[PDB]
Structure formats: structure tokens, C-alpha cells
């Protein structure tokens, strides 16, 4: 019988890895593609310095991380361990959005 | 004919430039006129701030057995100090990550 | 030239990785599209500010210091990009 | 030929060698430090500017800067900064 | 048998009554005593303009009602109607307090 | 002259009124002392700012405009008492 | 033989004082140089903002059968538009109260 | 007599009298309006100074405060306020 | 050698530019606008003539013009149009 961990043990393992880690978690080239796509809506023919795109990527990553830990606080507050979208709307609406 | 030019940072015994910060206040559009001791005081305040945060960063890097400071070490320095975190709750550090922080209920048993 | 549907370019496993860094161990499958929407709204706000700054700069190219101005004016200040 | 760009690399480097003779830096960490010092300088200077506005003083002094530091910096960071700045102001006055 | 309202009925009538109203909720003189007590702990012999007290008051009820609106939202997020201390702690932590 | 106990001056019925303004349906008994602590934290956080402005102004009496500054520094700007 | 002193607020056809706001920017310490059209633009945008919020206050007063504005009308005016809420998310109104708002689960069956 | 305290009440009376000739004013609400206009004035002026710094421009003109209004004031009021301001500055251009 | 026929193309083109700098116009749509402005102008002018006739006034004044604006234009269009015309005649009075 091939080896298989129980669920969550693996999850805590990459929790430890990725919370230890420092690098960006999302793929780069779709992030330039997306920022070009959405900046296309406001003004035409925009050119992007790679440093600006990286700074946007880090800001987005930190904003999402803060949102996710707030939803963690909300989820453990509701005596559950699995997050649901109303945690996200709650966290944003308490935050002021 | 003229006295030897002596730097004002040496007069204040400080590493941060008194003249540059003084010029920055003069072109920073904060007041029409600036007192002489105010940039000296500000440079001393900043020098203490950078001194303590660099001490924390060096201690954190020595914990990581690295002789050169890393943005990860800087994030560890900011978030593991409550008082600097209260200073800097709204800041984002590039490639800094976050603290190792797992909620107790998330652990097994 | 025209790009149409890069909103799903933020893949599901990337969101799982971000939740891992967020400290989430268990993530519902109904999470990802709202997180795409929230990221979407946030990026709209910041790049709208960014293109406003850049259009004031009379430049056709967006630059990094304009982006970090947009973030600090939005109250999510960035360090490490020429500030 | 390019135009010279201002930085705080040498001062922070001297301060690091003062607190830690054996330690180095990464350039990304130095970028964070430049953003840090510029940010704190902007915060304190703007706060002092509105204090100068509020008492209708067109002259900014180190008393105003001290008021801004006590107002913004939480905890004993403020009083340590006041002590260091007070020492610096006194030994500048004597020199 | 004397009339007696079911629990919550007078509570909701209080909700409507105090939410339509704008007049003050804190007795001003024990509050002013608390203000002077905290003030003399930092600088002695402080004197107060009445408007300074009033503003300190308006701001405090503003901050508190912000917390209880957040508390109500997080409590109905928690499938309860009774608020508990962990909820106010959660609201402060999500706000970054 | 000196005062030692006025946190109880924010009475439990007063906190009940505050909760009714906030839309609170049911109030636990443990809420009140916590609200006393949180209110104490906020009022001390703003009044240290206020006393800082008053000592910088070389005045002995607290003015309302300084309190307005003290609230707007934490971004909790109160309208109507400026000027 | 000087021409009659006519006013810049009338020159822009606007009610807010152009000269006072221009002076207030000049000694408000935002730049050493300032253009002539900037106080005109600024007076225009504040007049538009006051015009729309005073429209909302007037309708709120008339709906409550009051011919005099009260701060309760101001609070009801600002909070009933989401875009002004994004303008005024962190702003406190004295004696304003809150919107009449009951969570739906709080209501009885 | 006491020295003058300049305020923004009577202009609010005039603009309301244009939009609603009939209504009355309570004085603490009038103070709330003065706080509104002073607050928005400080926000726009700070953004104007910030943008004049970033483009290294010595002069506050209508064009960057238009940029600032597009930054701070959102959406519908932003575009309409831009409309009235451009109309006003063109009218002042025609003296 | 020719004789002029007057039109409203220049004014509608201008006000189109203040309301929308970036939009164009077709000439037949401008003919539609010419018919529109002439038709509304003749309606208001004839109704103004009848109002002047009813109360035995030989002078046409802005008051009955305002009356005719309430008379023809329904509700919202009427109240806002009365507002702009009122403020406009205030500037003309000050001129």
C-alpha cells in the first residue's frame, strides 16, 4: 500500500515552507499579462517597467495575505476550520470596504 | 584667510548629514524658515532609529548564520518588535514574508 | 494586441499558496473567484491611481515610484522601490 | 553620463559598522532602508509642518520636532529619541 | 395578570428609539470626572474647555458604536445574537487595534 | 482633588444604550468591563496627543481644537468644532 | 482713473472667495509658486461638493418636514450614498447618530 | 470689539440660497460644513504639494489639482467637479 | 456671390465640446438639433406671448419665460432648467 499522509499534515508542511519562504507565490508572466489587460481599460498603449510590476505584485501579495489571516481569525472565531466566502466579505467589511 | 571647513554632522557627532537633511527641509515646503537645531535633532532621531533597527537586523541575521542582512531578516525585525510594529503596522516590505505564526487550533490533537 | 480574459490567469494553486502563507489550512472551492474579484478591485484602484499619476507625468510608460506613491496614498505603503 | 542620484548608503553603512563591525547588507535591504528613512523623514517633517501651522509659527524648531516625535513614535522609542536628540542639540550648541 | 413583553421586544423598541435619536448616551459629569482623572495622570492641574470635553465625548461614542456595528456583523457571522468578549477582541484585531 | 475610580461612571445601562445604538440585540454581562477597558485605551491614546499639543502650545488649558487634531491624527476626524 | 474693483469670484461666476483661498494656499505652505487658475478650480470643486451635499441635506430636511437643517439631516445625507461614504469613510459627525439599520436575523418571525 | 475670525459660513448661505431659497440653518451644522470645506481643502492642497514635488514643479496650477481630484474624490463627483472646474477656469480665462 | 442662412451649428458644436471634448457629430444630426432648438424656441416664445397677452402685459419679461418653462417642461427638467436660468440671470444682473 503506497504511502499517503492524512490531510492537513501536508497542508501544515507547506504552511511552514511558504511562511518560511520569501519568494513570490504567483506566476510572473500572467501577472504582467493581467496588469496590461486591466490598465488597457483606463488608457491605451501603456508600457510597464518590470520593477513597477514587481512592486505591484508584492503589494497585491501582502494585501491578500493580510486578508487571508483576517479570514483565518474570522473562521477560528466561528469555531470552524474551513474558510467560506462570507469570511472574506466579513473581513473586508470590518476593514472598511 | 578662511577657517577650515568643518562638517556639522561632526559637530553633532552624528553619521547622518545635517546639511543634506537641512536642505531637504528647506525644499520640503514644510515651513518658510527652519531653526538651526531642528535638522540636527531630526538627524539624531533618525540615527537612533536606524541604529536600533540595524542592531535588530544584525542579531536576526546572526540567528540565521548570515553575515549580510536580508529583507526576510528585516520583516522578522519589524514584526517581532511590538513597538516598531505599532510604528509600522501599515507598511509592506518587499520579499519579506511574514512571521511563522500558526493558530493553536490548527495544530493536531 | 488586445487581452481579454487574464482574470483567471491568477490560478487556483497560486491562491492555495497565498492561503498557506495566510495561515489557512483548509480552503473551500468556492473561495477563488471572490478572491479574484477582491484582487481585481484592489488592482483596479491602485492602477487607476497609477495611470492618473503617470498621465500627470505626461509619460506613456508607468514607473515604479508612481506606483509606490499610489500605494501610500491608498494607505498600503511599499518599501524597497526607490522611496 | 547620467545625473547623480541622492542616497543614504554611506551613512547607513557607517551606522551599521558602528553597531556591528562584522555585518554586511544586501542591496534590496538598502532599498528598504532608503524607503524607510525617507518615509519617517516625510512623516515627522509633515507632522511638524502642521504643528507650525497650528500655533501659527512660521519658524520650525527642534521643540516642534520633539513634539512630533513624542506624538508619533509609540513607547520609549520617543523618549530615547528625545534623549539622543537632546544630547546632539547640546553638543552641537557647545560646538 | 400584569402585561409583560417577551424578551427582545423592548430591546428592539430600544433599538429603534435610540437609533432614531441623536441625543447623548453618556452621563456627561461622570465622564468628565474620568477625563480629568486620566488627564491628571499625565499632566497635573489640567483645565478643560467644555467643548474639548464634548468633542472627546462625541468621538468616544463614535468609536464605540463603530465597534458594536462590527461586533454585530461578526456575531451574526458567528450564528449567535449575544455578543461575547472574544468578538470585541476579534473586531479590534481585524481593525489592527 | 485626586480621583481614583471613574471608569464605573460609564454605567452598565449607559453601555446598554450604546449597544442599542449599535444594533446589539443581546448583551453579555462580561461585555461592560471590556468596553470600559477599550474605551479607556482609546481615550488615553487620544488624550496623550491632546496634552502633547497643549504643552507644545505653552498653554495649561486643554482646547477643543487640539482634541480635533488628536482625533484626526488617528484618522477619526470629527466635524463641527473646528474654528 | 482706476477701473472699478470687480472680484475674481464673480469673474469665475462663483460664490466661494477666490482671493481668500488663494491667500490661504499661499501661506498654507504648499509651494512657493502658484498658478492663477488653481484657486478658481479649487473654489469650483468645493462649491460643487457643498451644492450636492446641501441638495441631499435639503431633501432630508423636507422629508422629515423640517425647514431648518440639523446635523441628523447631514448624517442621513452622507450615509445614504455609497460614493460619499467612500469619500467619508473615517469621518465623524457630531450629534449625527447612525442610519436606522437592523440586521435581518435580529427581526422576529 | 474682538479681532476677526475668518470663516466660511456666508458663502454656504449663498450657495444654499441658490439651491434651496427656503431652508434654514442650524449653527452646529454650519460648523460641520466649515469642517468639511477645511478638511477637503487640506486634502487637496496636500495632494497638490505632493504632486508638485513629484514632478519637481515649483508652481501649483489647475492641472495637477485636477489630477489630485481624480485621485481623492471618486467617480461621478470627480468627473462632474472636473466639468464645473474646467467651465470656471475657461470663464476666468475669458476674464 | 451668396446670401447667408443662419444656423446653430457653431454653438451646439461648442457646447458639445465642453460636455464631451472627444466626441464628433454628423451634419444631419446637427440639422436635427437646429430643428430642435428652433422648435423649442418657438414654443417658449409663443407661450410667452400668450402669457403676456393674458395679463395685458406688452413687455415680455423673464418671469413669464420662467412660467412657460414650468408650463411645458415636466418636473425635473423644469426645476433644473429654472435653476440654471435663475443663476444665469443673476450673473447677468451682476454684469
JSON list of C-alpha atoms in Angstrom, two decimals, chain D:
[
{"chain": "D", "resi": 1, "resn": "UNK", "atom": "CA", "xyz": [26.92, 60.36, -18.48]},
{"chain": "D", "resi": 2, "resn": "UNK", "atom": "CA", "xyz": [23.95, 60.32, -16.12]},
{"chain": "D", "resi": 3, "resn": "UNK", "atom": "CA", "xyz": [22.72, 62.70, -13.43]},
{"chain": "D", "resi": 4, "resn": "UNK", "atom": "CA", "xyz": [23.81, 61.97, -9.87]},
{"chain": "D", "resi": 5, "resn": "UNK", "atom": "CA", "xyz": [21.12, 60.37, -7.70]},
{"chain": "D", "resi": 6, "resn": "UNK", "atom": "CA", "xyz": [20.92, 61.03, -3.97]},
{"chain": "D", "resi": 7, "resn": "UNK", "atom": "CA", "xyz": [21.20, 58.18, -1.46]},
{"chain": "D", "resi": 8, "resn": "UNK", "atom": "CA", "xyz": [21.78, 57.30, 2.19]},
{"chain": "D", "resi": 9, "resn": "UNK", "atom": "CA", "xyz": [24.08, 54.34, 1.50]},
{"chain": "D", "resi": 10, "resn": "UNK", "atom": "CA", "xyz": [27.24, 55.69, 3.12]},
{"chain": "D", "resi": 11, "resn": "UNK", "atom": "CA", "xyz": [25.58, 56.96, 6.31]},
{"chain": "D", "resi": 12, "resn": "UNK", "atom": "CA", "xyz": [23.64, 53.75, 6.95]},
{"chain": "D", "resi": 13, "resn": "UNK", "atom": "CA", "xyz": [26.83, 51.84, 6.17]},
{"chain": "D", "resi": 14, "resn": "UNK", "atom": "CA", "xyz": [28.76, 53.84, 8.79]},
{"chain": "D", "resi": 15, "resn": "UNK", "atom": "CA", "xyz": [25.96, 53.30, 11.32]},
{"chain": "D", "resi": 16, "resn": "UNK", "atom": "CA", "xyz": [25.98, 49.56, 10.63]},
{"chain": "D", "resi": 17, "resn": "UNK", "atom": "CA", "xyz": [29.74, 49.37, 11.12]},
{"chain": "D", "resi": 18, "resn": "UNK", "atom": "CA", "xyz": [29.26, 51.33, 14.35]},
{"chain": "D", "resi": 19, "resn": "UNK", "atom": "CA", "xyz": [26.69, 48.88, 15.71]},
{"chain": "D", "resi": 20, "resn": "UNK", "atom": "CA", "xyz": [28.08, 45.75, 14.03]},
{"chain": "D", "resi": 21, "resn": "UNK", "atom": "CA", "xyz": [31.64, 45.78, 12.64]},
{"chain": "D", "resi": 22, "resn": "UNK", "atom": "CA", "xyz": [31.20, 42.30, 11.14]},
{"chain": "D", "resi": 23, "resn": "UNK", "atom": "CA", "xyz": [27.89, 42.56, 9.26]},
{"chain": "D", "resi": 24, "resn": "UNK", "atom": "CA", "xyz": [27.00, 43.23, 5.64]},
{"chain": "D", "resi": 25, "resn": "UNK", "atom": "CA", "xyz": [23.96, 44.32, 3.66]},
{"chain": "D", "resi": 26, "resn": "UNK", "atom": "CA", "xyz": [22.04, 43.30, 0.59]},
{"chain": "D", "resi": 27, "resn": "UNK", "atom": "CA", "xyz": [21.08, 45.98, -1.93]},
{"chain": "D", "resi": 28, "resn": "UNK", "atom": "CA", "xyz": [17.38, 45.16, -1.54]},
{"chain": "D", "resi": 29, "resn": "UNK", "atom": "CA", "xyz": [17.73, 45.71, 2.20]},
{"chain": "D", "resi": 30, "resn": "UNK", "atom": "CA", "xyz": [19.36, 49.06, 1.45]},
{"chain": "D", "resi": 31, "resn": "UNK", "atom": "CA", "xyz": [16.44, 49.98, -0.79]},
{"chain": "D", "resi": 32, "resn": "UNK", "atom": "CA", "xyz": [14.12, 49.20, 2.11]},
{"chain": "D", "resi": 33, "resn": "UNK", "atom": "CA", "xyz": [16.31, 51.39, 4.33]},
{"chain": "D", "resi": 34, "resn": "UNK", "atom": "CA", "xyz": [16.19, 54.31, 1.89]},
{"chain": "D", "resi": 35, "resn": "UNK", "atom": "CA", "xyz": [12.41, 53.98, 1.68]},
{"chain": "D", "resi": 36, "resn": "UNK", "atom": "CA", "xyz": [12.29, 53.72, 5.48]},
{"chain": "D", "resi": 37, "resn": "UNK", "atom": "CA", "xyz": [14.36, 56.79, 6.24]},
{"chain": "D", "resi": 38, "resn": "UNK", "atom": "CA", "xyz": [12.66, 58.86, 3.54]},
{"chain": "D", "resi": 39, "resn": "UNK", "atom": "CA", "xyz": [9.26, 57.72, 4.86]},
{"chain": "D", "resi": 40, "resn": "UNK", "atom": "CA", "xyz": [9.99, 58.54, 8.50]},
{"chain": "D", "resi": 41, "resn": "UNK", "atom": "CA", "xyz": [11.54, 61.85, 7.47]},
{"chain": "D", "resi": 42, "resn": "UNK", "atom": "CA", "xyz": [8.40, 62.67, 5.47]},
{"chain": "D", "resi": 43, "resn": "UNK", "atom": "CA", "xyz": [6.12, 61.71, 8.38]},
{"chain": "D", "resi": 44, "resn": "UNK", "atom": "CA", "xyz": [7.96, 63.71, 11.03]},
{"chain": "D", "resi": 45, "resn": "UNK", "atom": "CA", "xyz": [8.54, 66.72, 8.78]},
{"chain": "D", "resi": 46, "resn": "UNK", "atom": "CA", "xyz": [4.90, 66.93, 7.66]},
{"chain": "D", "resi": 47, "resn": "UNK", "atom": "CA", "xyz": [3.67, 66.50, 11.21]},
{"chain": "D", "resi": 48, "resn": "UNK", "atom": "CA", "xyz": [5.97, 69.29, 12.36]},
{"chain": "D", "resi": 49, "resn": "UNK", "atom": "CA", "xyz": [4.70, 71.38, 9.45]},
{"chain": "D", "resi": 50, "resn": "UNK", "atom": "CA", "xyz": [1.12, 71.11, 10.65]},
{"chain": "D", "resi": 51, "resn": "UNK", "atom": "CA", "xyz": [2.25, 71.86, 14.22]},
{"chain": "D", "resi": 52, "resn": "UNK", "atom": "CA", "xyz": [3.88, 75.02, 12.87]},
{"chain": "D", "resi": 53, "resn": "UNK", "atom": "CA", "xyz": [0.56, 75.72, 11.16]},
{"chain": "D", "resi": 54, "resn": "UNK", "atom": "CA", "xyz": [-1.46, 75.14, 14.32]},
{"chain": "D", "resi": 55, "resn": "UNK", "atom": "CA", "xyz": [0.41, 77.51, 16.62]},
{"chain": "D", "resi": 56, "resn": "UNK", "atom": "CA", "xyz": [0.72, 79.92, 13.65]},
{"chain": "D", "resi": 57, "resn": "UNK", "atom": "CA", "xyz": [4.51, 79.73, 13.93]},
{"chain": "D", "resi": 58, "resn": "UNK", "atom": "CA", "xyz": [6.27, 80.35, 10.64]},
{"chain": "D", "resi": 59, "resn": "UNK", "atom": "CA", "xyz": [9.51, 79.06, 12.21]},
{"chain": "D", "resi": 60, "resn": "UNK", "atom": "CA", "xyz": [10.07, 75.36, 12.80]},
{"chain": "D", "resi": 61, "resn": "UNK", "atom": "CA", "xyz": [12.31, 74.41, 15.75]},
{"chain": "D", "resi": 62, "resn": "UNK", "atom": "CA", "xyz": [13.62, 71.28, 17.42]},
{"chain": "D", "resi": 63, "resn": "UNK", "atom": "CA", "xyz": [10.92, 71.78, 20.05]},
{"chain": "D", "resi": 64, "resn": "UNK", "atom": "CA", "xyz": [8.39, 71.18, 17.28]},
{"chain": "D", "resi": 65, "resn": "UNK", "atom": "CA", "xyz": [10.33, 68.15, 16.06]},
{"chain": "D", "resi": 66, "resn": "UNK", "atom": "CA", "xyz": [10.42, 66.80, 19.61]},
{"chain": "D", "resi": 67, "resn": "UNK", "atom": "CA", "xyz": [6.66, 67.32, 19.88]},
{"chain": "D", "resi": 68, "resn": "UNK", "atom": "CA", "xyz": [6.18, 65.39, 16.64]},
{"chain": "D", "resi": 69, "resn": "UNK", "atom": "CA", "xyz": [8.43, 62.55, 17.82]},
{"chain": "D", "resi": 70, "resn": "UNK", "atom": "CA", "xyz": [6.60, 62.26, 21.15]},
{"chain": "D", "resi": 71, "resn": "UNK", "atom": "CA", "xyz": [3.30, 62.38, 19.28]},
{"chain": "D", "resi": 72, "resn": "UNK", "atom": "CA", "xyz": [4.08, 59.81, 16.60]},
{"chain": "D", "resi": 73, "resn": "UNK", "atom": "CA", "xyz": [6.65, 57.39, 17.99]},
{"chain": "D", "resi": 74, "resn": "UNK", "atom": "CA", "xyz": [4.98, 54.97, 20.43]},
{"chain": "D", "resi": 75, "resn": "UNK", "atom": "CA", "xyz": [6.51, 53.99, 23.77]},
{"chain": "D", "resi": 76, "resn": "UNK", "atom": "CA", "xyz": [10.05, 54.52, 24.97]},
{"chain": "D", "resi": 77, "resn": "UNK", "atom": "CA", "xyz": [11.30, 54.93, 21.40]},
{"chain": "D", "resi": 78, "resn": "UNK", "atom": "CA", "xyz": [10.06, 58.50, 21.77]},
{"chain": "D", "resi": 79, "resn": "UNK", "atom": "CA", "xyz": [11.92, 59.27, 25.00]},
{"chain": "D", "resi": 80, "resn": "UNK", "atom": "CA", "xyz": [15.09, 57.56, 23.76]},
{"chain": "D", "resi": 81, "resn": "UNK", "atom": "CA", "xyz": [14.88, 59.70, 20.62]},
{"chain": "D", "resi": 82, "resn": "UNK", "atom": "CA", "xyz": [14.35, 62.78, 22.80]},
{"chain": "D", "resi": 83, "resn": "UNK", "atom": "CA", "xyz": [17.40, 61.88, 24.89]},
{"chain": "D", "resi": 84, "resn": "UNK", "atom": "CA", "xyz": [19.62, 61.30, 21.85]},
{"chain": "D", "resi": 85, "resn": "UNK", "atom": "CA", "xyz": [18.41, 64.42, 20.07]},
{"chain": "D", "resi": 86, "resn": "UNK", "atom": "CA", "xyz": [18.77, 66.50, 23.23]},
{"chain": "D", "resi": 87, "resn": "UNK", "atom": "CA", "xyz": [22.37, 65.33, 23.62]},
{"chain": "D", "resi": 88, "resn": "UNK", "atom": "CA", "xyz": [23.02, 66.10, 19.94]},
{"chain": "D", "resi": 89, "resn": "UNK", "atom": "CA", "xyz": [21.49, 69.57, 20.22]},
{"chain": "D", "resi": 90, "resn": "UNK", "atom": "CA", "xyz": [23.52, 70.37, 23.35]},
{"chain": "D", "resi": 91, "resn": "UNK", "atom": "CA", "xyz": [26.86, 69.21, 21.95]},
{"chain": "D", "resi": 92, "resn": "UNK", "atom": "CA", "xyz": [26.11, 70.98, 18.69]},
{"chain": "D", "resi": 93, "resn": "UNK", "atom": "CA", "xyz": [25.38, 74.14, 20.69]},
{"chain": "D", "resi": 94, "resn": "UNK", "atom": "CA", "xyz": [28.69, 73.75, 22.51]},
{"chain": "D", "resi": 95, "resn": "UNK", "atom": "CA", "xyz": [30.42, 73.23, 19.15]}
]
